């Protein structure tokens, strides 16, 4: 259950495919309002490949459904997230995650 709202036009027709790299500048916040991660604070694009279960399923599905030059906010349910086995000292168990996702290339 991922809800995507198009906050950017994203006229690019390119779509991610299997076995491809994908760069996203992601910013995540907990639904109360505090953030835990921001790749842009590191000034480095987050390179991840579609598949291989490198990232949670919600983030990968959201990145797959949205395209180049597009921005969107992903509503990640705890079922598709860490859930009960939350991140140690970072994310409390049974919490939702909101991501500021955007491709730059591929």
Author numbering: 1 to 106
What does the paper say about this structure?
With the expected functionality of the R615C mutation confirmed, we solved cryo-EM structures of wild-type and R615C pRyR1, under nominally Ca2+-free conditions (5 mM EGTA), in the presence of FKBP12.6, which was used as a bait protein for purification. Nearby residues that form potential interactions with Arg615 are Asn1678 in Jsol and Glu2175 in Bsol. For wild-type pRyR1, the major class still represents closed channels, but for R615C pRyR1 the combination of cryo-EM condition and mutation results in mostly open channels. The narrowest point in WT pRyR1, found at Ile4935, is now wide enough to support permeation.
Ryanodine receptors (RyR) are >2-MDa membrane proteins that allow for the release of Ca2+ from the ER and SR, thus mediating a range of Ca2+-dependent processes. Each forms homotetrameric assemblies of ~5000 residue long subunits. Here, a collection of cryoEM structures provides insights into the molecular consequences of MHrelated RyR mutation R615C, and how apoCaM opens RyR1.
